[PDB]
């Protein structure tokens, strides 16, 4: 048998704000965080907009000297991680430090640091490569730097499962706690891919919306005029905690993480199967894991990337798993507002799934002006919908056909 | 409840050979795979050598058309994965595809591809970035492409924990099986960081041996004249199987994986503690997890990177964990011969640890001419040592204070 896992701390950088409550405010108001990218010549690029983190002050978290050593994606992860730990009220001690671990991931990692260090390599030669290039860029340095700053001696690792990173990180952090390997984990993901390599790289695959004239309308999941995902930066971190540990210190419990599902499509490198067979298996795995019937699910935070084939696979998958319950659950894409934070998408959308539970409100899918063929589910078009939510799912579907599902329940 | 996990398949590319048996023959003969690098011009670099994979033919495994789109670290990962699965005799069917997953990781991932595409972006512009840049370079696409080629629909993920990646990948994959999330897992890691950014980045940090004039003598773990690690390329993959599943199909069992430890040092971004504290916590977690008396340990495959601080930390950790039994077990570093395969180090060394059990021989630490102050254990200097090995331990340490231990024993 198995220990129960609750959420006692949440932290976030998003295109909607510098913390969870500002972000959540934007979500329920249907605000877009998408805009032309600044301080950067995108003249030769077919996409010139995305979700940037606006006004981020790393010196709230690190000295200028330590921040200079770390890629933006690491700064973002640390910000969310430090917010999440502070939000939890947890005190690290000699008595508990070996029971507190970290799993903060990234899908794409340190492109900004790779670009600057390439610029030096090609222009001047290898002698201008930063000494901090490697430890300042490697994906596991959010877990590493967090563990060093706070003295965490529990499981220390990082997932990289592309657009599924955040979902997987949180789920496998929850298994560490459930199976007694840890009492507390900081888990989630961070990403800064709004640079030339990210816009360029995704641009070259024609994966990105090129709607440069109306950036706020670019991300339009399940809408017949969608033309690919919007690329976005940020981080999400949760403090996961064994229930008895949380109750003993009198922790505030936002929700219970009751279920985690993983699956592989074994289909295509970037395209999901049309019927979403992988996403269906993954969601069924998560519900079986939670001991729940599909009928008990009230809210789904969709992957909902605004890609032609991705959005319609998730409709198929939901209809397949949920049968005659499929129209009764509400399902929304907060990527309609935030765009796609890649590896951090699962982390911030777990937070939105938890806050949907706390506030009894389904976040909207904005821009859903003209649902596409078969997109006839309750996709919460345009406006937030207050409703009953006991159980919320969060899905992520990534490149290589890697799937993640998290199941959260109201706690009382 | 918690199930037992055995090794039924292994695969490898190393600087010593294009498979396991060829690589193992090199190990037992004390051969170095380190040589001046030929595939690029390093006259600007303070390190001009490493452990290259020599004569690798990707068209033994994949079509030239798909090979061309993948970073060498993905090619190496798939080659080792394919060997391991063939070596297992396992047949993937509709009855078991959902119960077979893959966790093949990398420390640095697609550095070559990112460099070349970064060169295209700066010299030419974003219209010259490869459409395959992202799916051909990101760390999770070994697990991704393996699942697509073999039809594996089980848990599909990747770790990135720097020089610990391979040990963590194998360990967490065993936990998947132990806890019933899968019956089979292909796990390990791959690395190809020998490009300008790689040798330049580690060179900027002064982390690498600069013994350019005698590369086969550069990697000299615990030797007083060591001057940093030797960068090497390749792949290790293992087929992990639930015991009863392996028994049921009459699989050949190399060994049982009885123990896994993880621990963060929470010490420093890149330097390990002098006293071996994080390593010690990790090995103790691993030994308790295996339900072992530490005097049961016969053979330790050390991290053994040929850094001043790393090498002596490990002696301290082993003396602290094993007390007087530290003087009875044999410890060696195959990095004396392979060099440091970073995220793939834990995977090839897990295979060497298993083969030490099959053949009852401790691999040598070559180039240990003048052991350093306090390096007074049986380090298997110069020559392989036939000896009783019931229990073998494999240690990895990484940047971020991230530690891993695997415990294998002979299976009757
Ligand atoms: O984003 C990508 C691929 C699309 C290109 N990368 C994968 C490997 N990771 C990496 C880590 C450390 C380092 F030194 C360099 C690269 C993250 C960057
Ligand atoms: O000169 C410095 C400042 C500490 C003073 N370095 C920063 C990068 N560090 C590092 C070590 C190994 C390595 F492979 C990569 C990076 C340590 C060296």
TrEMBL record, chains A, B:
Alphabetical UniProt keywords: Acyltransferase, Fatty acid biosynthesis, Fatty acid metabolism, Lipid biosynthesis, Lipid metabolism, Transferase
One of the GO biological process terms: fatty acid biosynthetic process
Reaction(s) catalysed by this chain's protein: a fatty acyl-[ACP] + malonyl-[ACP] + H(+) = a 3-oxoacyl-[ACP] + holo-[ACP] + CO2; (9Z)-hexadecenoyl-[ACP] + malonyl-[ACP] + H(+) = 3-oxo-(11Z)-octadecenoyl-[ACP] + holo-[ACP] + CO2
Any Gene Ontology CC annotation: cytosol
SUPFAM superfamilies documented for this protein: Thiolase-like
Presence of keyword Phosphoprotein: no
Pathway stated in the Swiss-Prot or TrEMBL entry: Lipid metabolism; fatty acid biosynthesis
Domain annotation Ketosynthase family 3 (KS3): ranges: 2-410
Active-site residues per Swiss-Prot or TrEMBL entry: 163
Gene3D superfamilies tied to this protein: 3.40.47.10
One matching Pfam family: ketoacyl-synt
GO molecular function: 3-oxoacyl-[acyl-carrier-protein] synthase activity
UniProt xrefs under NCBIfam families: fabF, PRK06333.1, PRK07314.1
UniProt record similarity statement: Belongs to the thiolase-like superfamily. Beta-ketoacyl-ACP synthases family.
Protein name (Swiss-Prot/TrEMBL): 3-oxoacyl-[acyl-carrier-protein] synthase 2
Originating organism: Pseudomonas aeruginosa
Gene this protein is translated from: fabF
